[PDB]
Amino acid sequence: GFFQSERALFEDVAQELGLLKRSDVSWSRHPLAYLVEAADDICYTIIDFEDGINLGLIPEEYALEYMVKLVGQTIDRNKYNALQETSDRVSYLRALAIGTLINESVDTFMKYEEEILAGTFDQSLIDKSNYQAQITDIINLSIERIYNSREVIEKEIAGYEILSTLLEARCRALDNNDTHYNQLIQQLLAPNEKSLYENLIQICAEVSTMTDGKALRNYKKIKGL
Amino acid sequence: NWEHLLSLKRQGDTAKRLRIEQDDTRLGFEVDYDRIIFSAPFRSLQDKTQVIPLDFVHTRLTHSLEVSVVGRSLGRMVGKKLLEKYPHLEQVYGYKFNDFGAIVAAAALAHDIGNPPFGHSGEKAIGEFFKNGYGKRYKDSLTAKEYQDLIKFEGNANGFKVLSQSKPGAQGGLRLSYATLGAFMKYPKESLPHKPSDHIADKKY
Numbered sequence: 161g162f163f164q165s166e167r168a169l170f171e172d173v174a175q176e177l178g179l180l181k182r183s184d185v186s187w188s189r190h191p192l193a194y195l196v197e198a199a200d201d202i203c204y205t206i207i208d209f210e211d212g213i214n215l216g217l218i219p220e221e222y223a224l225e226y227m228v229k230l231v232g233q234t235i236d237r238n239k240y241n242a243l244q245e246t247s248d249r250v251s252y253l254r255a256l257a258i259g260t261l262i263n264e265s266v267d268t269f270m271k272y273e274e275e276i277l278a279g280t281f282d283q284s285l286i287d288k289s290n291y292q293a294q295i296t297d298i299i300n301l302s303i304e305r306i307y308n309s310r311e312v313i314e315k316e317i318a319g320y321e322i323l324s325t326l327l328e329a330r331c332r333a334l335d336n337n338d339t340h341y342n343q344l345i346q347q348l349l350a351p352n353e354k355s356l357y358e359n360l361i362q363i364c365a366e367v368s369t370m371t372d373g374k375a376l377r378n379y380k381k382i383k384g385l
Numbered sequence: 386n387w388e389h390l391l392s393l394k395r396q397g398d399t400a401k402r403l404r405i406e407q408d409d410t411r412l413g414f415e416v417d418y419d420r421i422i423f424s425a426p427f428r429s430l431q432d433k434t435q436v437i438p439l440d441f442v443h444t445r446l447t448h449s450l451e452v453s454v455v456g457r458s459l460g461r462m463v464g465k466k467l468l469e470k471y472p473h474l475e476q477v478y479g480y481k482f483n484d485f486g487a488i489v490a491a492a493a494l495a496h497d498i499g500n501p502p503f504g505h506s507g508e509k510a511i512g513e514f515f516k517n518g519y520g521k522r523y524k525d526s527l528t529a530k531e532y533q534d535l536i537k538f539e540g541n542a543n544g545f546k547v548l549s550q551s552k553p554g555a556q557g558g559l560r561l562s563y564a565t566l567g568a569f570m571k572y573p574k575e576s577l578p579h580k581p582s583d584h585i586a587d588k589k590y
């Protein structure tokens with residue numbers, strides 16, 4: 161969770177908070193970190209599922225079949241059937257699944273409060289919930305048909321190449337700051353005294369700061385395109 | 386001696402080409418301007434970078450046109466004042482103040498004719514190709530002086546080569562007057578030694 165250059169700050173934070181020492185330095189999780197993790201888990205699992213459903217890669221039959229126990233004792237069939245567009249029905253199901261998962265996660269967290277506070281809890285809150293087969297099926301379907309689409313693979317390869325050239329250009333500029341081209345690259349990419357490890361981590365952070373469109377434009381205009 | 390700097394002979398000649406035996410309608414230095422105007426390297430200058438590559442911002446041709454005018458104005462004043470100082474030039478040989486202006490204008494017009502594209506970065510790229518590129522493979526097969534040129538490519542040398550490039554059927558290239566060639570040369574020295582002093586004429590070759 162942290163680099164070597166931020167060890168002291170996290171040590172101070174841990175010492176103040178009171179996290180239990182486990183070992184190399186290592187501590188125990190904050191329970192609020194468990195809550196954040198569960199919230200984040202429920203969101204991507206449900207939002208990614210519904211996004212795959214509207215974009216044309218997954219049929220509404222899977223939407224209704226895979227989401228039955230989640231929305232079981234919370235749905236009104238008359239209102240569900242009164243809707244016409246698929247988007248409203250999917251939102252309606254998404255709304256009900258999020259509520260029930262929130263309630264179940266709160267109950268699960270309150271079940272294991274002593275174990276979590278003592279640092280002996282070794283799992284998450286979602287994996288200790290009754291509804292797991294449906295979640296696993298949704299995740300597997302998303303992996304099969306959303307993450308393996310041709311456009312996703314093409315964009316990943318393009319990003320793969322763009323980051324590779326950007327990193328090699330930054331490293332070549334950093335190495336020997338003597339030639340005119342290197343000075344030009346330094347003035348363009350990083351126009352704003354440290355050791356080798358900090359220099360590299362700052363380069364990585366600067367690369368991670370750029371957005372998709374900015375990185376694409378920079379890659380095109382460094383190549384004259 | 387000023388009678389020798391204002392030479393009118395061209396490459397491949399055998400006569401004397403005296404000043405007093407020429408028609409004032411078309412002077413020899415004006416023929417140089419006419420030849421440079423109609424040349425292809427001069428016409429290619431309209432697509433080359435001054436400061437901002439690739440509007441109302443100047444290119445390499447307008448720049449030359451402006452210099453061709455200012456230098457002509459400077460040279461005409463200078464020639465008028467020399468003739469005022471030296472009276473034998475206009476009494477025995479027959480020189481006029483327009484000669485200096487024409488020579489300087491002709492030299493000014495083609496002073497930036499051999500520069501590589503993209504302005505300042507092109508020469509640096511060409512030089513770095515033979516130093517930190519594949520061209521370093523050719524280092525062992527060339528002498529010190531030849532390798533020096535290649536790793537320190539210059540626009541002045543390229544311009545002189547373009548102006549004096551011999552081809553089958555066209556010996557001497559544009560065949561300009563020797564006075565124009567002398568006025569065009571800014572660094573009358575070879576590539577080695579590299580910067581032997583702080584003089585203005587030995588910074589480059």
Ligand SMILES: Nc1ncnc2c1ncn2[C@H]1C[C@H](O)[C@@H](COP(=O)(O)OP(=O)(O)OP(=O)(O)O)O1
Nearest residue numbers: 234235251252253254255256257258259260262263
């Ligand atoms: N308890 C919750 N806390 C936070 N967000 C929630 C909760 N339940 C659902 N959400 C999400 C998904 C919902 O579509 C959206 C708005 O919630 P909300 O309007 O209360 O649900 P709903 O559409 O099921 O209404 P209703 O109470 O009529 O069943 O926020």
Ligand SMILES: Nc1ncnc2c1ncn2[C@H]1C[C@H](O)[C@@H](COP(=O)(O)OP(=O)(O)OP(=O)(O)O)O1
Nearest residue numbers: 435436437448497500504505506540541571588589
């Ligand atoms: N570092 C630079 N980056 C970009 N343009 C530059 C730079 N230095 C000069 N210029 C531009 C300004 C002028 O419009 C243009 C023409 O100048 P130039 O003739 O190349 O210079 P110079 O007088 O130093 O050359 P030289 O001594 O080789 O004849 O170059």
Ligand SMILES: [Mg+2]
Nearest residue numbers: 200201203204
């Ligand atoms: Mg997240």
